[PDB]
């Protein structure tokens, strides 16, 4: 049987979590994140009795291009016990939740993936790209053209300067596509991670600027590496100044960060190659729930000319689309399709990470008119580069 969990079902859920997720934050931490789950925003499958499958969405706020902020159902905590595997439990659970997500009026739903081959079938496409840059800071000399050739950056204890990080991040997320609202309970947990753990992670330090900050710490195994967990920069000045400081860490050999494909750091240095890209992976995954609500709400490029078409989502209806002067009108229709794609393919397009020509070349979105293909690339392209906010 499938149903909404009572209070009594939570102990069981945490066991399943602990057995399924190696990075399971823990019972007390998870209670903080469970405030973000709305009434009937979580489902469990009991064994006829113990819990054998679960899933839930949280109430997030995703920033999309043109600085517009959509409500987003953040899919998370999804697991099926090894004893009840390959039995229809995920399919039954991932529907139902999508029924509840759609009934609550969420234009989009989003997740972070544990494997990239599970989520495509449920209409989730990769929407942002993660991009690890590792800099050998012994050789890193800045370009003459880089800004700031007194220092405004400060080295501080992260816990002592909570409020400044909130104000900076609040600015950040509102202007950057892919940004998420970070409620108070998530800051509680983030500043709790900064403290020195007993025989595990080392102590976290912060570099603070008025327009930005970096959270970082030395890696436990590699003592000469500094893992920057989070760099939030609202101005280019802050971005440059924060990296000037990071490269000033004379203790370290290497500085690593998980950032986005258009991070300007390689161009800040004399040698572009010194900021080696060591690891690429898909970050945020999107399933567009309400196609016209999602497309209308999004901003588009002024530069491209006015154009009209009809778009089909594979088992998801068919929609007239007119884009012009950087905004779109999208309405349902029975008229013939000029473009066809699976629901996930629209997700990848939506924040502008993946080009429609690349997807078309793989035959993932079909269209006859080649001129209409080029106009999708230009239209769905994002002015501000796309970034990944935080995992959930």
């Amino acid at each position: 049987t499938l149903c909404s969990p009572t209070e009594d079902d939570w102990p069981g859920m945490f066991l399943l979590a602990a057995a399924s997720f190696t990075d399971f934050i823990g019972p007390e931490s998870a209670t903080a994140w469970r405030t973000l789950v709305p009434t009937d925003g979580a489902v469990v499958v009991r064994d006829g009795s113990e819990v054998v499958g679960m899933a839930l969405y949280m109430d997030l706020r995703l920033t999309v291009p043109g600085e517009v902020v959509l409500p987003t159902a953040g899919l998370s905590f999804v697991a099926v016990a090894p004893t009840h595997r390959r039995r229809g439990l995920l399919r039954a659970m991932c529907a139902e939740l999508h029924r509840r997500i759609a009934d609550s009026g969420y234009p989009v739903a989003a997740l972070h993936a544990s494997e990239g081959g599970i989520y495509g079938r449920f209409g989730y496409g990769p929407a942002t790209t993660l991009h690890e840059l590792t800099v050998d800071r012994r050789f890193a000399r800045f370009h003459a053209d880089a800004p700031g050739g007194g220092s405004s950056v400060r080295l501080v204890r992260p816990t002592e300067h909570r409020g400044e990080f909130e104000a900076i991040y609040e600015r950040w997320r509102q202007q950057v596509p892919g940004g998420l609202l970070r409620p108070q309970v998530l800051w509680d947990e983030l500043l709790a991670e900064c403290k020195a753990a007993p025989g595990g992670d080392r102590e976290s330090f912060a570099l603070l600027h008025p327009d930005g900050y970096a959270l970082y710490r030395v890696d436990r195994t590699d003592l000469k590496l500094a893992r920057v967990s989070e760099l939030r920069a609202v101005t280019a000045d802050a971005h440059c100044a924060l990296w000037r400081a990071l490269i000033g860490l004379d203790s370290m050999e290497r500085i690593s960060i998980i950032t986005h494909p258009q991070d300007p750091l390689p161009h800040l240095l004399t040698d572009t190659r010194l900021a080696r890209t060591t690891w690429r992976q898909d970050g945020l995954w999107l399933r567009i729930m309400n196609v016209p609500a999602a497309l209308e709400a999004r901003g588009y490029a002024h530069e491209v000319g006015e154009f009209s078409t009809v778009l089909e989502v594979s088992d998801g209806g068919r929609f007239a689309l007119k884009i012009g002067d950087g905004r779109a009108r999208c309405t349902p229709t029975d008229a013939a399709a000029e473009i066809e794609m699976d629901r996930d393919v629209l997700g990848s397009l939506y924040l502008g990470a993946h080009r429609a020509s690349t997807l078309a070349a793989a035959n993932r979105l079909r269209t006859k008119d080649s001129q209409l293909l080029r106009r999708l690339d230009a239209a769905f392209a994002s002015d501000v580069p796309v970034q990944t906010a935080f995992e959930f």
Partner: peptide, 4 residues
């Protein structure tokens, strides 16, 4: 970095 979090949850799942």
């Amino acid at each position: 970095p979090a949850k799942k």
